[PDB]
């Protein structure tokens, strides 16, 4: 009996260890109302969380507590974890030990303060923080190979060979789902359809998930988009109003492969995956090309795998065979790994206890992280 709780910037995936898929999946947001001095009606919650805030988007100002895999407002994150254990999962945190997930190369204060809350506020019996990328490999039953776990908050590239990780080869890029969502708003505003508010940004994320797809040749796709209106698809908003996004459909996910569009002055998700493999030892490169995994929900774009293969193959040597690993459950790839890890009898020892936390302090986490 143990709890796996993925603390993703976009969506918080929580559930019991051993189960196939996560029990409760809700958007990680806190909804505070745009209140005036006028008195409010009955059935009023001071701050709404998750699926409740997703229902009452109209009035509530949606504030994401985790920004680029860094917890900015801890009071907000506490209210999400309270919604996770007590309401969503229907379980006491004192009974079950809780596994959390942190992105690699995050600030040290993040892991420090995270565990402090779990030990003091919720009074958990044991707490282990893990790298999202390390878990994602277990999903595919692969010990060897690199992963390109692109989330809503961040995208990170962690090469692991024969159950041994290369820490110095790890590269983090701040370009992620939320930056693409923010980019899609700007180009939709250029077409005509203006989306400004926090509630409207959530509707633009629903537009992104459904329509947007990765093009094989961007320049070739822009030529077809100009000539014919075949790529132009219609989407119905919450309001009866319908919109035809056009070429901006495949223009949004292009930003992943060339950040110049967003204006970050950084390497693309294809180029960073190559650079990470080159930073590793020369011998093991072979297996990393052969076992390139794509994880998170930012790798569920239709035809990212085809475009990824093409771009890596061009950069990589001709003799090498480049196979991209795209399992059907990419969105729940971080959690399903956690469920496999927590269930294993070997992992029982690796848990950090309250007694261990009390004596040493919150600094113990940095030793027993990975």
């Amino acid at each position: 009996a143990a709890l796996v709780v993925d603390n993703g910037s976009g969506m918080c995936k929580a559930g019991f260890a051993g189960d196939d898929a996560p029990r409760a999946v809700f958007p990680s947001i806190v909804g505070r109302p745009r209140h005036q001095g006028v008195m409010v009606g009955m059935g009023q919650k001071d701050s709404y969380v998750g699926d409740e805030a997703q229902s009452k988007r109209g009035i509530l100002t949606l504030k994401y507590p985790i920004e680029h895999g860094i917890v900015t407002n801890w009071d907000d994150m506490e209210k999400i974890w309270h919604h996770t254990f007590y309401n969503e999962l229907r379980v006491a945190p004192e009974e079950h030990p809780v596994l959390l997930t942190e992105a690699p190369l995050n600030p040290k204060a993040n892991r420090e303060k995270m565990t402090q809350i779990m030990f003091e506020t919720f009074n958990t019996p044991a707490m282990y923080v893990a790298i999202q990328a390390v878990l994602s490999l277990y999903a595919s039953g692969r010990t060897t190979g690199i992963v390109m776990d692109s989330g809503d908050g961040v995208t990170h590239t962690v090469p692991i060979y024969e159950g041994y990780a290369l820490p110095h080869a790890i590269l983090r890029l701040d370009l992620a789902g939320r930056d693409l969502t923010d980019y899609l708003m700007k180009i939709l505003t250029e077409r005509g359809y203006s989306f400004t508010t926090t509630a409207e940004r959530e509707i633009v994320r629903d537009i992104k998930e459904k329509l947007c797809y990765v093009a094989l040749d961007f320049e070739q796709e822009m030529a077809t988009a100009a000539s014919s209106s075949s790529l132009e698809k219609s989407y119905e908003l919450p309001d009866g109003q319908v919109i035809t996004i056009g070429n901006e459909r495949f223009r949004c996910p292009e930003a992943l492969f060339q950040p110049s569009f967003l204006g970050m002055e950084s390497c693309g998700i294809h180029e960073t995956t190559f650079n990470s493999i080159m930073k590793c030892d020369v011998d093991i490169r072979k297996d990393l090309y052969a076992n390139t995994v794509l994880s998170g929900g930012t790798t569920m774009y239709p035809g990212i795998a085809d475009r990824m293969q093409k771009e890596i193959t061009a950069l990589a040597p001709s003799t090498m065979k480049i196979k991209i690993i795209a399992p059907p459950e990419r969105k729940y790839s971080v959690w399903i790994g956690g469920s496999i890890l927590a269930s294993l009898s070997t992992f029982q020892q690796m848990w950090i206890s309250k007694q261990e936390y009390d004596e040493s302090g919150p600094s113990i986490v940095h030793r027993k992280c990975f």
Binding site: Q36, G37, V38, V40, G43, I59, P238, D239, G240, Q241
Partner: protein, 379 residues
């Protein structure tokens, strides 16, 4: 605790009674009969000196708490229903009268629109309030009034009473009873507001959209030769006993049209819902449209709810509202109490909640200390 009293001070009529009741106990014209004055002065009057307003409200609240209701003012709480954007000095005076003179325990300044929503039970709904002075609309979404997307036009009782008086004076046909069997025009220079109100209620009705649209173009006479529908029969109304005013059939179904007339600006009682709904947040559109509420005594007029809902669906197809509010299903809520006493019923339902009332409501001990009533303006 005791059952808290509910008062709702309006320009035409004031609703009064006790909390946890099916309807208001007393509903009476908001006036006071002062010695010397032949016509009684109106108790609520905006933009006058505070001392003169204080005396009128002191006189009125006294009549409500003794002649109409029979209960000690100091003993039990108050739930003062007043519309949003009610003038600052008036609301400040009304509270100061209740707290200083009467020494009430605590007053709760509820907005009429949010109270009207409670009576149905639905958490989110659009609320139109066709009153005496101004016909105001205010979207309420899950307990939060959206002041950003407010709307008001002077197309209520006062604007309708004035329109009736004007039309009657043009086609004036009275039988004084002094060789006045023949049509006699404007024997009286002005008609008293009490008579005009009684004519409006009994004689005048709201026409169908199809017939109304013809009436608009008919009186305009826009390059057409007698293109009006057949009016109802002329009704004879007694004035001050002997004088019998013959009301023309045209006046009955034309007087109302000033509310639903476009008048180039595209500003009717119908348009005000769609003008507000288009300005609302994109997520809230479909929930508010589906849950419409029509309070106010002006909407009691026979066949108003059918004309409004029809005029809405016609103005939807108009190119301005066709993009945003094109494929929307507008459905009206039927509140439990009558259209006049929806506002009051909410305050009574709220007044029955003794636990929440005491907390939200402003205590006298706080007012005596501070002297600052909380409002939707800055503190």
């Amino acid at each position: 605790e005791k059952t808290a009293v509910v008062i709702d001070l309006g320009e035409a009529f004031t609703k009064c009674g006790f909390a946890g009741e099916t309807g208001p106990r007393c509903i009476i014209p908001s006036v006071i009969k002062k010695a010397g004055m032949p016509k009684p002065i109106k108790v609520v009057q905006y933009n006058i000196n505070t001392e003169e307003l204080y005396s009128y409200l002191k006189e009125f609240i006294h009549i409500l708490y003794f002649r109409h209701l029979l209960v000690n003012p100091r003993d039990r709480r108050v739930v003062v229903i007043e519309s949003v954007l009610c003038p600052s000095h008036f609301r400040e005076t009304l509270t100061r009268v209740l707290f200083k003179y009467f020494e009430v325990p605590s007053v709760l300044l509820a907005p009429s629109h949010l109270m009207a929503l409670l009576t149905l039970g639905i958490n989110s709904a659009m609320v139109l309030d066709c009153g005496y002075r101004e016909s105001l609309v205010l979207p309420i979404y899950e307990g939060i009034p959206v002041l950003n997307c407010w709307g008001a036009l002077p197309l209520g009782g006062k604007a309708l009473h004035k329109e009736l008086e004007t039309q009657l004076l043009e086609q004036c046909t009275v039988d004084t009873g002094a060789a006045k069997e023949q049509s006699l025009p404007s024997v009286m220079g002005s008609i008293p507001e009490g008579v005009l109100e009684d004519i409006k209620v009994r004689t005048c009705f709201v026409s169908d959209l199809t017939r109304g649209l013809k009436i608009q173009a008919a009186k305009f006479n826009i390059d057409g030769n007698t293109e009006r529908p057949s009016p109802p029969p002329n009704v004879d109304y007694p004035l001050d006993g002997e004088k019998i005013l013959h009301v023309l059939g045209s006046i009955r179904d034309s007087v109302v049209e000033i509310l639903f007339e476009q008048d180039n600006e595209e500003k009717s009682v119908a348009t005000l819902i769609l003008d507000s709904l288009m300005q609302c947040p994109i997520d809230t559109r479909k929930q508010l449209a589906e849950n419409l509420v029509i309070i106010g005594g002006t909407s009691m007029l026979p066949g108003f709810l059918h004309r409004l809902l029809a005029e809405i669906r016609y103005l939807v197809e108009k190119p301005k509202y066709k993009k945003t509010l094109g494929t929307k299903t507008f459905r009206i809520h039927t509140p439990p109490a009558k259209a006049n006493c929806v506002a009051w019923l909410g305050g009574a339902i709220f007044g029955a909640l003794q636990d929440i009332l005491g907390s939200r409501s402003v205590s006298k001990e706080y007012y005596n200390q501070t002297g600052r009533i909380p409002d939707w303006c800055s503190l």
